[PDB]
Amino acid sequence: RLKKRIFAAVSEGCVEELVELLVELQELCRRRVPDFLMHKLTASDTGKTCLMKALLNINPNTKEIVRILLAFAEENDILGRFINAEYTEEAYEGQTALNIAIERRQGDIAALLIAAGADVNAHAKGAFFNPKYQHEGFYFGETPLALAACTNQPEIVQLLMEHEQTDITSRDSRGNNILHALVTVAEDFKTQNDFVKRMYDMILLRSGNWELETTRNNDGLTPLQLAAKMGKAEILKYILSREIKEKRLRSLSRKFTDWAYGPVSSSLYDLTNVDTTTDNSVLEITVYNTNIDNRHEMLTLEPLHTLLHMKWKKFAKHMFFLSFCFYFFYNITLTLVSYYRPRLLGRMFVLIWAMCISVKEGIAIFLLSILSDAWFHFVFFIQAVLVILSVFLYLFAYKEYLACLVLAMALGWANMLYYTRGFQSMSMYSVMIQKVILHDVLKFLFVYIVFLLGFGVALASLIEKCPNKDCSSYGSFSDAVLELFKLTIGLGDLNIQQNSKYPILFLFLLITYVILTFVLLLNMLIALMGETVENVSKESERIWRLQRARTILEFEKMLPEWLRSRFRMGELCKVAEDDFRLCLRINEVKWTEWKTHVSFLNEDPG
Amino acid sequence: VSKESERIWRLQRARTILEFEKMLPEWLRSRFRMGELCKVAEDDFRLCLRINEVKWTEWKTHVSFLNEDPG
Amino acid sequence: WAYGPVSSSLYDLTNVDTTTDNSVLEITVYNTNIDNRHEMLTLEPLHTLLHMKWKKFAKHMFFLSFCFYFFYNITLTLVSYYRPRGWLQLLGRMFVLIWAMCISVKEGIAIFLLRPSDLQSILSDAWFHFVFFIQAVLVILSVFLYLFAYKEYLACLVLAMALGWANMLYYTRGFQSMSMYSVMIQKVILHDVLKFLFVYIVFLLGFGVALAS
Amino acid sequence: TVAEDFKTQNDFVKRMYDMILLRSGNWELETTRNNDGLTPLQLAAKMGKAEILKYILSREIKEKRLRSLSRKFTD
Numbered sequence: 005r006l007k008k009r010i011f012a013a014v015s016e017g018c019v020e021e022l023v024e025l026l027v028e029l030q031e032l033c034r035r036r037v038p039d040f041l042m043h044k045l046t047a048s049d050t051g052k053t054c055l056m057k058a059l060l061n062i063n064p065n066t067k068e069i070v071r072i073l074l075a076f077a078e079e080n081d082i083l084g085r086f087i088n089a090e091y092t093e094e095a096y097e098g099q100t101a102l103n104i105a106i107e108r109r110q111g112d113i114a115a116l117l118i119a120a121g122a123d124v125n126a127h128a129k130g131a132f133f134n135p136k137y138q139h140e141g142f143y144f145g146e147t148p149l150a151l152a153a154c155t156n157q158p159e160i161v162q163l164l165m166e167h168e169q170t171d172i173t174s175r176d177s178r179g180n181n182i183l184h185a186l187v188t189v190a191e192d193f194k195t196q197n198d199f200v201k202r203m204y205d206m207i208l209l210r211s212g213n214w215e216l217e218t219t220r221n222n223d224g225l226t227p228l229q230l231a232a233k234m235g236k237a238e239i240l241k242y243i244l245s246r247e248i249k250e251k252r253l254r255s256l257s258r259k260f261t262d263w264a265y266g267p268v269s270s271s272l273y274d275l276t277n278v279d280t281t282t283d284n285s286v287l288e289i290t291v292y293n294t295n296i297d298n299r300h301e302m303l304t305l306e307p308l309h310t311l312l313h314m315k316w317k318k319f320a321k322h323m324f325f326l327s328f329c330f331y332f333f334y335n336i337t338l339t340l341v342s343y344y345r346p347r348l349l350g351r352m353f354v355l356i357w358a359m360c361i362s363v364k365e366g367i368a369i370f371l372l373s374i375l376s377d378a379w380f381h382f383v384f385f386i387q388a389v390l391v392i393l394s395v396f397l398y399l400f401a402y403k404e405y406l407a408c409l410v411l412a413m414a415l416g417w418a419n420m421l422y423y424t425r426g427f428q429s430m431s432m433y434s435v436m437i438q439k440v441i442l443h444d445v446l447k448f449l450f451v452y453i454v455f456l457l458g459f460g461v462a463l464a465s466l467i468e469k470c471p472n473k474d475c476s477s478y479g480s481f482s483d484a485v486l487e488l489f490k491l492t493i494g495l496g497d498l499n500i501q502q503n504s505k506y507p508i509l510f511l512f513l514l515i516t517y518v519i520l521t522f523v524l525l526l527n528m529l530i531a532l533m534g535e536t537v538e539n540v541s542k543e544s545e546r547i548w549r550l551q552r553a554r555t556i557l558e559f560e561k562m563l564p565e566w567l568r569s570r571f572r573m574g575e576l577c578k579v580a581e582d583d584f585r586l587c588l589r590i591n592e593v594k595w596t597e598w599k600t601h602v603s604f605l606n607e608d609p610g
Numbered sequence: 611v612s613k614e615s616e617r618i619w620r621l622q623r624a625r626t627i628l629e630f631e632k633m634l635p636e637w638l639r640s641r642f643r644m645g646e647l648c649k650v651a652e653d654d655f656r657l658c659l660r661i662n663e664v665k666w667t668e669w670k671t672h673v674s675f676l677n678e679d680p681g
Numbered sequence: 682w683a684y685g686p687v688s689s690s691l692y693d694l695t696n697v698d699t700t701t702d703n704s705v706l707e708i709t710v711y712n713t714n715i716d717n718r719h720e721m722l723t724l725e726p727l728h729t730l731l732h733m734k735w736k737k738f739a740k741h742m743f744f745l746s747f748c749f750y751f752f753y754n755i756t757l758t759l760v761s762y763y764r765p766r767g768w769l770q771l772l773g774r775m776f777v778l779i780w781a782m783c784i785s786v787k788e789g790i791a792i793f794l795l796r797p798s799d800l801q802s803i804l805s806d807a808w809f810h811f812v813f814f815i816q817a818v819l820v821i822l823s824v825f826l827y828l829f830a831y832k833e834y835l836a837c838l839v840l841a842m843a844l845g846w847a848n849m850l851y852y853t854r855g856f857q858s859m860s861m862y863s864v865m866i867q868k869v870i871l872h873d874v875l876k877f878l879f880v881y882i883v884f885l886l887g888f889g890v891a892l893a894s
Numbered sequence: 895t896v897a898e899d900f901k902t903q904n905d906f907v908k909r910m911y912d913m914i915l916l917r918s919g920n921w922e923l924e925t926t927r928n929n930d931g932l933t934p935l936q937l938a939a940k941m942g943k944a945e946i947l948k949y950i951l952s953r954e955i956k957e958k959r960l961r962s963l964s965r966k967f968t969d
């Protein structure tokens with residue numbers, strides 16, 4: 005047939021004479037109308053046309069070939085639905101020839117196709133271009149502008165934005181516009197040369213306006229909140245501290261120096277969607293999202309760090325010390341009620357406070373990874389439940405209340421860790437609350453149960469029924485399991501006299517058990533110690549900073565509306581003709597970048 | 611031993627896979643027999659295995675094909 | 682195929698995919714005179730061939746191997762605990778006996794064609810053929826000594842149960858997480874615990890003679 | 895008073911100190927006491943400007959005329 009011949013002549017490109025003669029033959033067959041021409045000019049299995057197959061296979065003679073193809077399509081008044089054709093397969097649906105021309109870094113042919121009238125809003129709405137998860141498919145933004153900006157082709161991005169029909173505010177299937185897409189594709193500093201920062205700045209300045217940055221995708225996130233959700237520390241550092249000095253695009257900045265005199269410089273940072281006064285700010289998302297493992301570097305950014313420090317030093321230090329004091333006196337009263345138990349009028353101060361915790365942490369659990377952040381919610385709730393249960397059992401005629409009361413006292417003294425985590429002495433607890441939490445200890449427990457059960461059977465089997473202390477504490481299976489457990493708990497004793505027909509085999513298996521349990525214990529030991537003390541101190545400091553931020557936000561959530569408005573970090577500042585956006589002032593001193601100061605809001609510093 | 615674990619796991623895994631594949635009956639092996647025929651040249655027709663690799667650290671351009679239409 | 686960071690390539694499997702006399706896969710896997718297999722079993726065609734063989738049949742064959750050994754070990758434990766000190770007990774004992782004979786012939790065949798330089802490293806899979814064979818031999822020997830009028834069948838039975846539960850480490854080295862855990866455990870034991878135990882037995886015997894005299 | 899460190903200033907205050915001290919070649923600048931009685935050297939001692947103090951305490955002018963401004967004389 006002629007379809008395969010045209011496709012081969014257009015993919016191989018060894019000479020355009022083959023495709024010229026084949027197109028002459030095709031026109032001859034057509035003279036004997038548009039649907040037939042393109043049904044024979046496309047591949048019915050995918051919807052691909054000769055133009056896509058020509059651009060998918062770039063060869064030293066492909067520009068002339070696409071020129072020939074477009075000339076033949078325009079000479080038949082079909083170029084409209086031929087240059088705008090798109091795939092039909094489920095995986096690559098929506099992909100057109102301009103996507104392929106840009107993905108092949110062919111700028112000249114791309115300009116050719118845009119001049120010929122290829123619509124520049126073609127959304128590659130396929131399951132390959134909108135992957136369920138990354139690393140299975142290629143998500144760039146489902147648009148020729150997003151594809152030109154994601155593949156680092158600023159020439160084509162200029163060619164696309166200078167066009168007339170381009171939609172810079174176009175939103176793809178995922179709800180993302182160009183800026184969300186740039187945020188998702190951006191990875192790092194020197195991994196791919198950090199061109200996405202350049203493209204972000206260029207696309208935001210070219211369309212100088214706040215609509216691209218205030219647009220929410222289908223998850224209700226803006227490009228800034230989307231950089232906060234993921235761990236895009238570089239794009240977040242750029243957007244947050246973004247200083248444009250062009251006189252017309254100054255209102256696009258998020259940081260405004262107003263003060264510089266010499267090395268001293270007082271800058272303002274913008275706190276609109278950043279300072280926890282809205283639905284979910286960069287602060288909220290950066291602090292509470294436990295899916296990046298990069299909060300160590302994102303909570304030290306320019307406005308966020310000082311915002312956390314200010315909230316702390318303003319009210320969270322006081323609220324935290326007050327709650328620590330209240331829990332400390334709660335625990336002291338609990339200890340004195342547990343010591344002077346009736347084997348004395350304040351025995352109720354505990355109860356009330358218990359119920360308070362019982363509801364507070366209770367509600368705190370009802371509103372929701374969740375064993376590293378919310379652990380203390382569960383332990384405080386369990387402690388309060390134990391206390392109220394001890395009281396209920398004490399006023400009833402139960403003598404089992406002492407167990408719960410002593411357990412509650414002990415668990416409260418253990419919960420005292422939540423308040424002392426950055427104290428360099430409760431460091432190992434505050435760090436093994438995370439590594440030992442889930443997987444490090446359950447493997448040990450499984451292997452230890454296997455050891456215990458197997459060796460219990462092996463040792464109980466070796467023992468002979470005897471006339472009723474039996475001369476053997478390894479009698480039934482339960483007695484051997486108990487002896488072995490007591491052994492790994494240093495509560496036991498090795499006797500070479502256990503009333504066995506094979507005492508040497510019994511001794512061998514007992515010592516084998518001892519040594520194997522010691523190996524398991526040593527594994528868990530070197531696991532939870534894992535010293536590298538520089539790095540473990542990094543880990544403890546990082547955990548303290550993260551929990552400090554988390555509790556700062558928890559404490560800010562507790563205050564009423566009026567107290568929150570009275571704390572309310574951020575001075576109102578005019579930054580443009582009429583902008584008046586709440587900012588946060590940061591004074592700095594730099595003795596290295598000596599420059600004449602031409603960007604400032606106030607000419608008289610102070 | 612952090613990595614030595616992966617080394618020993620990979621070696622034991624490969625040896626287990628190969629001995630299991632040897633244990634099967636010849637018709638079962640013929641049934642599984644990963645790899646599909648593919649015409650490479652005028653008459654080449656070799657058993658090729660298609661591997662799709664996504665490397666997200668890519669900075670280059672590709673222009674070649676055997677069936678340009680993505681599968 | 683390549684479009685962006687994606688690339689669908691077509692590798693050749695002519696003398697590679699284990700359908701010839703000795704392919705690159707079988708040679709790369711079975712040759713233990715190099716100590717470079719860790720780097721060669723990661724090349725794209727061999728890597729994906731092993732992955733697909735796994736997914737297709739070897740995952741299931743391995744899980745069935747593990748399940749059969751697990752239930753054989755459980756029945757061995759049950760006949761060791763409930764020993765005589767014949768309705769269904771002897772059914773289970775005949776299960777463990779025929780399965781011990783099967784395991785013994787299998788691992789003995791594997792040992793016969795087990796070339797040296799496989800046993801070069803202690804943390805190597807080749808070593809397991811020996812412990813599986815020893816345990817199956819202990820089981821059949823205990824059944825032989827129990828059919829006769831011997832008392833020492835219990836030592837062999839308990840040793841066989843203990844060695845089977847130890848041999849489950851071969852299967853825990855086949856799963857992925859349990860691979861790292863079990864290899865760490867077995868490294869600790871076979872390398873450091875044995876050296877320390879040699880020098881510590883020296884200490885024990887010396888100071889025991891010293892304090893006893 | 896203005897000198898900070900090397901990681902923050904790259905040591906230009908030492909160079910400006912040398913320049914302004916040589917161009918006005920006389921002990922009137924180094925023997926002057928502020929409203930605390932501190933000379934520039936005692937002031938560099940009081941606030942721990944270790945780089946400025948190291949410069950002043952061992953300052954050797956090899957020029958023949960400005961050698962009386964030296965504090966260390968390699969002979």
Ligand SMILES: COc1ncnc(OC)c1C(=O)Nc1nc(C(F)(F)F)c(-c2ccnc(C(C)(C)C#N)c2)s1
Pocket residue numbers: 411413414415417418420421
């Ligand atoms: C700063 O710590 C303290 N300071 C002064 N006094 C204290 O107790 C009187 C304490 C203290 O930690 N007490 C505790 N109580 C309990 C409870 F089980 F009862 F909940 C503790 C507990 C809970 C869960 N797993 C364990 C382990 C794994 C270690 C075991 N086994 C221990 S720990």
Ligand SMILES: COc1ncnc(OC)c1C(=O)Nc1nc(C(F)(F)F)c(-c2ccnc(C(C)(C)C#N)c2)s1
Pocket residue numbers: 454455456457458459462515516519520840842843844846847849870874
């Ligand atoms: C998952 O492990 C288990 N789960 C449940 N039950 C079990 O045993 C009842 C087991 C188990 O490990 N059993 C074992 N059997 C034996 C054998 F000596 F017989 F070979 C073991 C052995 C072999 C060589 N060197 C030692 C050391 C160095 C430690 C000494 N001394 C111990 S260990």
Ligand SMILES: COc1ncnc(OC)c1C(=O)Nc1nc(C(F)(F)F)c(-c2ccnc(C(C)(C)C#N)c2)s1
Pocket residue numbers: 491492493494495517518519521522525
């Ligand atoms: C034959 O003994 C074993 N075989 C195999 N494995 C074993 O442990 C894994 C063991 C064993 O002795 N275990 C132990 N457990 C505990 C406990 F912490 F629970 F109390 C032990 C204990 C008891 C009392 N005073 C301490 C001091 C203060 C010295 C400390 N530290 C530790 S000792």
